[PDB]
Paper text:
We adopted the Z domain of [name] and its affibody binder dimer complex as a model system. We next generated libraries at the interface of a weakly associating dimer (Z+ ZSPA-1) with micromolar affinity to determine if we could affinity-mature the interface by coevolution. To clarify these inter-residue co-variations discovered from the sequence data, we determined crystal structures of 10 coevolved pairs that spanned a range of cross-reactivities and orthogonalities (5 from [name] and 5 from LL2). From the structures, we could verify clear compensatory changes between the residues showing the most significant covariations (13A-9B / 17A-31B) in both [name] and LL2 library mutants.
Author numbering:
A (entry chain A): 2 to 57
B (entry chain B): 3 to 58
Write the structure that this text describes.
């Protein structure tokens, strides 16, 4: 099934857009995605929770 | 240092090309993700495409 690649591309693309991450946080999410791409939906939700809590 | 800097910088430059559409931005970002050493060629290609899709 395509859910795996589809979910991985979504996580990479959205984390790239999250405005309230810093570069070290963004790159840490990117490296986790490379290390375990099966976790991409959870990593996206971590990144988005984190991005929302860091909003101005 | 940063094992993801070349992807992160080029990906940020891809998505800000205002005349590319969403499927195009997504395809260059996934090419960079898989092949960050091609970042300068992929950016050149993305920029060429962007300016060919401007109204002028």
């Amino acid at each position: 099934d395509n859910k795996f690649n589809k979910e991985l591309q979504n996580a990479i693309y959205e984390i790239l857009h999250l405005p309230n991450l810093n570069e070290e946080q963004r790159n840490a999410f990117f490296q986790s995605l490379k290390d375990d791409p099966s976790q991409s939906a959870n990593l996206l939700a971590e990144a988005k929770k984190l991005n929302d809590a860091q909003a101005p």
